Each structure stands twice: as C-alpha cells, then as structure tokens.
C-alpha cells in the first residue's frame, strides 16, 4: 500500500505517480530504500 511497497512490482514509469499520490516528492531517496 506503501510507496516503498508499490515501487517492488511497479514499473519505474510510475514510480512518480505512486510517490505523488503519498505524498512523497523525495522519490529519488525512496529508490534509494527500495535498492
């Protein structure tokens, strides 16, 4: 449910659209947690 969460099995073209949803504008530091 997570950004972090979703990022695993979504695919990178909407990594943005699920950081944006969350709130989360640091989407570059949440790839960084997901690698």
């Given at each position: 449910?997570?950004?972090w969460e979703i990022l695993?099995?979504?695919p990178p073209?909407?990594?943005e659209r699920?950081?944006?949803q969350h709130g989360v504008?640091?989407?570059r530091?949440?790839?960084k947690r997901l690698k």
């Open positions: 449910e997570d950004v695993r099995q979504a073209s909407e990594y699920i950081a944006f504008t640091d989407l530091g949440m790839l």
